[PDB]
Design an enzyme around this catalytic site. Sequence first.
Site, PDB file in Angstrom:
ATOM      1  N   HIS A  67      -2.529  -1.788   9.151  1.00  0.00           N
ATOM      2  CA  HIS A  67      -2.733  -2.037   7.701  1.00  0.00           C
ATOM      3  C   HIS A  67      -1.777  -1.350   6.755  1.00  0.00           C
ATOM      4  O   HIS A  67      -1.812  -1.578   5.530  1.00  0.00           O
ATOM      5  CB  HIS A  67      -4.165  -1.807   7.271  1.00  0.00           C
ATOM      6  CG  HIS A  67      -4.794  -0.661   7.922  1.00  0.00           C
ATOM      7  ND1 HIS A  67      -4.371   0.601   7.719  1.00  0.00           N
ATOM      8  CD2 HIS A  67      -5.832  -0.598   8.851  1.00  0.00           C
ATOM      9  CE1 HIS A  67      -5.110   1.451   8.471  1.00  0.00           C
ATOM     10  NE2 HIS A  67      -6.003   0.712   9.173  1.00  0.00           N
ATOM     11  N   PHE A  94       2.821   3.859   3.139  1.00  0.00           N
ATOM     12  CA  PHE A  94       3.394   2.901   2.193  1.00  0.00           C
ATOM     13  C   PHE A  94       2.326   1.828   1.805  1.00  0.00           C
ATOM     14  O   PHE A  94       1.672   1.255   2.693  1.00  0.00           O
ATOM     15  CB  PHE A  94       4.694   2.260   2.739  1.00  0.00           C
ATOM     16  CG  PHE A  94       5.850   3.224   2.813  1.00  0.00           C
ATOM     17  CD1 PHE A  94       6.660   3.460   1.691  1.00  0.00           C
ATOM     18  CD2 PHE A  94       6.154   3.918   4.021  1.00  0.00           C
ATOM     19  CE1 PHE A  94       7.703   4.380   1.739  1.00  0.00           C
ATOM     20  CE2 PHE A  94       7.197   4.855   4.068  1.00  0.00           C
ATOM     21  CZ  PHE A  94       7.989   5.063   2.931  1.00  0.00           C
ATOM     22  N   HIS A  95       2.107   1.643   0.494  1.00  0.00           N
ATOM     23  CA  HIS A  95       1.176   0.610  -0.044  1.00  0.00           C
ATOM     24  C   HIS A  95       1.884  -0.303  -0.968  1.00  0.00           C
ATOM     25  O   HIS A  95       2.646   0.148  -1.873  1.00  0.00           O
ATOM     26  CB  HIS A  95      -0.011   1.228  -0.801  1.00  0.00           C
ATOM     27  CG  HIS A  95      -0.949   2.029   0.090  1.00  0.00           C
ATOM     28  ND1 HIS A  95      -0.720   3.349   0.421  1.00  0.00           N
ATOM     29  CD2 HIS A  95      -2.115   1.649   0.757  1.00  0.00           C
ATOM     30  CE1 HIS A  95      -1.719   3.807   1.228  1.00  0.00           C
ATOM     31  NE2 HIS A  95      -2.588   2.768   1.437  1.00  0.00           N
ATOM     32  N   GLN A 112       2.903   7.512  -0.209  1.00  0.00           N
ATOM     33  CA  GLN A 112       2.007   8.622  -0.270  1.00  0.00           C
ATOM     34  C   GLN A 112       2.291   9.685   0.797  1.00  0.00           C
ATOM     35  O   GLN A 112       2.106   9.430   1.998  1.00  0.00           O
ATOM     36  CB  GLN A 112       0.571   8.092  -0.188  1.00  0.00           C
ATOM     37  CG  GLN A 112       0.235   7.207  -1.368  1.00  0.00           C
ATOM     38  CD  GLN A 112      -1.119   6.464  -1.284  1.00  0.00           C
ATOM     39  OE1 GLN A 112      -1.574   5.869  -2.289  1.00  0.00           O
ATOM     40  NE2 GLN A 112      -1.757   6.495  -0.129  1.00  0.00           N
ATOM     41  N   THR A 181      -7.448   7.046   0.352  1.00  0.00           N
ATOM     42  CA  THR A 181      -7.562   5.703  -0.220  1.00  0.00           C
ATOM     43  C   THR A 181      -7.781   4.647   0.872  1.00  0.00           C
ATOM     44  O   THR A 181      -7.715   3.418   0.607  1.00  0.00           O
ATOM     45  CB  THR A 181      -6.320   5.251  -1.040  1.00  0.00           C
ATOM     46  OG1 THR A 181      -5.158   5.327  -0.217  1.00  0.00           O
ATOM     47  CG2 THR A 181      -6.053   6.179  -2.274  1.00  0.00           C
TER      48      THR A 181
END
Length: 239
Positions: A67, A94-95, A112, A181
Amino acid sequence: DEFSYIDGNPNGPENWGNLKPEWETCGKGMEQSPIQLRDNRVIFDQTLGKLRRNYRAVDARLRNSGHDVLVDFKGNAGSLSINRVEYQLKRIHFHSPSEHEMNGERFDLEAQLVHESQDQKRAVVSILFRFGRADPFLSDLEDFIKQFSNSQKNEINAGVVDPNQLQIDDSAYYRYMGSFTAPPCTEGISWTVMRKVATVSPRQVLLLKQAVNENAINNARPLQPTNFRSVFYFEQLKS
Protein backbone atom coordinates in the site's frame (compact mmCIF):
# COMPACT_ATOMS: atom_id res chain seq x y z
CA ASP A 1 -1.71 -6.27 5.43
CA GLU A 2 -5.47 -6.02 5.00
CA PHE A 3 -6.94 -2.51 4.86
CA SER A 4 -8.04 -0.31 1.89
CA TYR A 5 -8.04 3.44 1.07
CA ILE A 6 -11.43 3.34 -0.76
CA ASP A 7 -14.02 5.50 0.97
CA GLY A 8 -17.12 3.45 1.49
CA ASN A 9 -15.49 0.04 1.17
CA PRO A 10 -15.83 -2.49 4.07
CA ASN A 11 -12.01 -2.16 4.72
CA GLY A 12 -11.75 1.53 3.84
CA PRO A 13 -10.48 4.21 6.25
CA GLU A 14 -13.70 4.93 8.07
CA ASN A 15 -13.85 1.20 9.08
CA TRP A 16 -10.13 0.51 9.82
CA GLY A 17 -10.94 0.73 13.51
CA ASN A 18 -13.53 -2.12 13.20
CA LEU A 19 -11.52 -4.54 11.06
CA LYS A 20 -9.50 -6.06 13.96
CA PRO A 21 -8.95 -5.43 17.64
CA GLU A 22 -5.30 -4.45 17.06
CA TRP A 23 -6.56 -1.48 14.91
CA GLU A 24 -9.09 -0.13 17.31
CA THR A 25 -7.30 3.19 17.95
CA CYS A 26 -7.78 4.00 14.24
CA GLY A 27 -11.41 4.27 15.16
CA LYS A 28 -11.38 5.35 18.78
CA GLY A 29 -8.33 7.57 19.28
CA MET A 30 -8.75 11.34 19.57
CA GLU A 31 -5.17 12.33 18.45
CA GLN A 32 -5.18 10.78 15.05
CA SER A 33 -3.27 12.04 11.97
CA PRO A 34 -3.24 13.50 9.47
CA ILE A 35 -4.84 16.86 10.37
CA GLN A 36 -5.61 20.11 8.60
CA LEU A 37 -2.78 22.61 9.30
CA ARG A 38 -4.36 26.15 9.69
CA ASP A 39 -2.06 29.21 10.06
CA ASN A 40 -4.87 31.09 11.82
CA ARG A 41 -4.96 28.47 14.68
CA VAL A 42 -1.25 27.83 15.36
CA ILE A 43 0.69 28.68 18.51
CA PHE A 44 4.02 30.44 17.74
CA ASP A 45 6.92 29.02 19.65
CA GLN A 46 10.32 30.55 18.68
CA THR A 47 11.88 28.32 21.37
CA LEU A 48 11.43 25.34 19.00
CA GLY A 49 14.46 26.37 16.82
CA LYS A 50 15.34 25.47 13.28
CA LEU A 51 14.96 21.74 12.92
CA ARG A 52 18.14 19.92 13.98
CA ARG A 53 19.02 16.92 11.78
CA ASN A 54 22.23 14.85 11.62
CA TYR A 55 21.58 12.38 8.81
CA ARG A 56 24.07 9.87 7.31
CA ALA A 57 24.07 8.23 3.85
CA VAL A 58 23.73 4.46 4.55
CA ASP A 59 22.80 1.31 2.69
CA ALA A 60 19.04 0.77 2.27
CA ARG A 61 16.25 -1.41 0.99
CA LEU A 62 13.22 -0.31 -0.98
CA ARG A 63 10.17 -2.06 0.30
CA ASN A 64 6.69 -2.25 -1.15
CA SER A 65 4.13 -3.15 1.50
CA GLY A 66 1.52 -3.31 -1.23
CA HIS A 67 0.00 0.00 0.00
CA ASP A 68 3.05 2.24 -0.02
CA VAL A 69 6.70 2.23 -0.94
CA LEU A 70 9.15 3.00 1.83
CA VAL A 71 12.92 3.31 2.11
CA ASP A 72 14.18 1.14 4.96
CA PHE A 73 17.73 2.03 6.06
CA LYS A 74 20.02 -0.85 7.11
CA GLY A 75 22.68 1.12 8.97
CA ASN A 76 22.50 4.16 11.15
CA ALA A 77 21.06 6.80 8.73
CA GLY A 78 21.68 9.36 11.49
CA SER A 79 19.25 11.18 13.67
CA LEU A 80 16.83 14.05 14.38
CA SER A 81 17.19 15.88 17.65
CA ILE A 82 14.20 17.46 19.50
CA ASN A 83 14.97 18.95 22.96
CA ARG A 84 18.20 16.92 23.04
CA VAL A 85 16.23 13.65 22.79
CA GLU A 86 17.76 11.88 19.79
CA TYR A 87 15.49 9.98 17.31
CA GLN A 88 17.13 7.69 14.80
CA LEU A 89 16.01 7.91 11.19
CA LYS A 90 14.59 4.41 10.32
CA ARG A 91 12.14 4.61 7.42
CA ILE A 92 10.67 7.01 4.80
CA HIS A 93 7.10 6.32 3.54
CA PHE A 94 5.58 7.80 0.40
CA HIS A 95 1.86 8.88 0.06
CA SER A 96 0.16 10.15 -2.99
CA PRO A 97 -1.77 12.51 -2.73
CA SER A 98 -0.59 14.15 0.54
CA GLU A 99 -2.31 13.20 3.77
CA HIS A 100 -1.72 16.54 5.62
CA GLU A 101 -3.28 19.66 4.22
CA MET A 102 -1.93 23.25 4.66
CA ASN A 103 -4.62 25.91 4.72
CA GLY A 104 -7.06 23.66 2.91
CA GLU A 105 -4.57 22.67 0.18
CA ARG A 106 -3.80 19.01 -0.51
CA PHE A 107 -0.44 18.34 -2.19
CA ASP A 108 0.76 15.89 -4.86
CA LEU A 109 2.94 13.69 -2.63
CA GLU A 110 3.98 13.50 1.00
CA ALA A 111 7.17 11.78 2.30
CA GLN A 112 7.13 10.69 5.88
CA LEU A 113 10.43 10.19 7.77
CA VAL A 114 9.91 7.81 10.69
CA HIS A 115 12.43 8.20 13.56
CA GLU A 116 12.67 6.34 16.88
CA SER A 117 14.60 7.06 20.07
CA GLN A 118 16.23 4.41 22.32
CA ASP A 119 13.14 4.90 24.61
CA GLN A 120 11.02 3.81 21.62
CA LYS A 121 9.58 7.39 21.37
CA ARG A 122 8.51 8.18 17.73
CA ALA A 123 8.91 11.39 15.66
CA VAL A 124 7.81 11.80 12.06
CA VAL A 125 8.99 14.64 9.79
CA SER A 126 6.79 15.17 6.63
CA ILE A 127 7.66 16.86 3.36
CA LEU A 128 4.85 18.07 1.14
CA PHE A 129 5.42 18.21 -2.61
CA ARG A 130 3.88 19.92 -5.61
CA PHE A 131 4.51 18.84 -9.21
CA GLY A 132 7.56 20.65 -10.63
CA ARG A 133 11.21 19.84 -10.90
CA ALA A 134 12.25 16.28 -10.14
CA ASP A 135 12.92 15.34 -6.53
CA PRO A 136 16.75 14.66 -6.19
CA PHE A 137 16.19 11.87 -3.58
CA LEU A 138 13.61 9.92 -5.66
CA SER A 139 15.79 10.39 -8.74
CA ASP A 140 18.39 8.00 -7.35
CA LEU A 141 15.60 5.64 -6.47
CA GLU A 142 13.50 5.55 -9.66
CA ASP A 143 14.93 2.51 -11.35
CA PHE A 144 14.50 0.46 -8.17
CA ILE A 145 10.92 1.72 -7.87
CA LYS A 146 10.15 0.76 -11.54
CA GLN A 147 10.97 -2.91 -10.68
CA PHE A 148 7.98 -3.16 -8.32
CA SER A 149 5.77 -2.38 -11.33
CA ASN A 150 5.02 -5.92 -12.57
CA SER A 151 7.49 -8.18 -10.76
CA GLN A 152 6.73 -10.04 -7.53
CA LYS A 153 9.73 -8.53 -5.74
CA ASN A 154 8.68 -6.41 -2.86
CA GLU A 155 12.14 -5.86 -1.37
CA ILE A 156 14.96 -4.37 -3.51
CA ASN A 157 18.48 -3.40 -2.49
CA ALA A 158 18.68 0.25 -3.38
CA GLY A 159 22.27 0.47 -2.29
CA VAL A 160 23.57 3.38 -0.27
CA VAL A 161 20.82 5.96 0.07
CA ASP A 162 21.44 9.52 1.11
CA PRO A 163 18.83 11.29 3.38
CA ASN A 164 20.56 14.69 2.70
CA GLN A 165 19.26 14.69 -0.88
CA LEU A 166 15.76 15.26 0.71
CA GLN A 167 14.23 18.76 0.19
CA ILE A 168 14.02 19.77 3.78
CA ASP A 169 14.17 23.41 4.76
CA ASP A 170 14.81 23.51 8.49
CA SER A 171 13.81 27.17 8.98
CA ALA A 172 9.98 26.63 9.42
CA TYR A 173 7.58 23.85 10.47
CA TYR A 174 4.43 22.82 12.22
CA ARG A 175 4.70 20.69 15.41
CA TYR A 176 1.83 18.67 17.01
CA MET A 177 1.08 15.27 18.61
CA GLY A 178 -0.66 12.77 16.44
CA SER A 179 -0.66 9.15 15.31
CA PHE A 180 0.53 6.85 12.57
CA THR A 181 -1.60 7.36 9.45
CA ALA A 182 -2.04 3.64 8.71
CA PRO A 183 -3.15 0.91 11.09
CA PRO A 184 -2.53 0.36 14.00
CA CYS A 185 -2.77 4.16 14.11
CA THR A 186 -0.85 4.28 17.38
CA GLU A 187 -0.76 7.72 19.09
CA GLY A 188 2.11 9.46 21.02
CA ILE A 189 3.74 10.34 17.69
CA SER A 190 5.50 13.71 17.42
CA TRP A 191 4.81 15.17 14.00
CA THR A 192 6.84 17.86 12.35
CA VAL A 193 5.47 19.09 9.00
CA MET A 194 7.91 21.27 6.99
CA ARG A 195 6.43 24.62 5.92
CA LYS A 196 8.45 24.82 2.67
CA VAL A 197 6.86 22.74 -0.08
CA ALA A 198 9.11 20.59 -2.31
CA THR A 199 8.87 19.65 -5.90
CA VAL A 200 8.48 16.17 -7.46
CA SER A 201 7.93 15.27 -11.09
CA PRO A 202 4.78 13.65 -12.42
CA ARG A 203 6.89 10.72 -13.61
CA GLN A 204 8.20 10.08 -10.07
CA VAL A 205 4.66 10.01 -8.64
CA LEU A 206 3.56 7.79 -11.53
CA LEU A 207 6.30 5.32 -10.62
CA LEU A 208 5.16 5.25 -6.99
CA LYS A 209 1.51 4.75 -7.98
CA GLN A 210 2.43 1.87 -10.32
CA ALA A 211 4.06 -0.01 -7.48
CA VAL A 212 1.13 -0.57 -5.04
CA ASN A 213 -2.05 -2.63 -5.04
CA GLU A 214 -5.00 -1.28 -6.87
CA ASN A 215 -6.85 -0.22 -3.77
CA ALA A 216 -3.95 2.00 -2.72
CA ILE A 217 -3.27 3.94 -5.96
CA ASN A 218 -4.28 6.87 -3.78
CA ASN A 219 -2.85 6.08 -0.40
CA ALA A 220 -3.75 9.13 1.69
CA ARG A 221 -5.76 8.59 4.85
CA PRO A 222 -8.61 11.19 5.11
CA LEU A 223 -8.07 14.19 7.44
CA GLN A 224 -8.92 13.39 11.10
CA PRO A 225 -10.62 15.73 13.61
CA THR A 226 -8.09 18.09 15.29
CA ASN A 227 -10.14 17.74 18.51
CA PHE A 228 -8.84 21.02 20.08
CA ARG A 229 -5.33 19.69 20.16
CA SER A 230 -2.66 22.37 19.87
CA VAL A 231 -0.59 22.91 16.75
CA PHE A 232 2.70 24.78 17.23
CA TYR A 233 4.57 26.60 14.51
CA PHE A 234 8.11 27.79 14.30
CA GLU A 235 9.64 30.07 11.69
CA GLN A 236 13.09 31.68 11.71
CA LEU A 237 13.09 35.43 11.22
CA LYS A 238 15.89 37.39 9.50
CA SER A 239 15.33 39.13 12.87
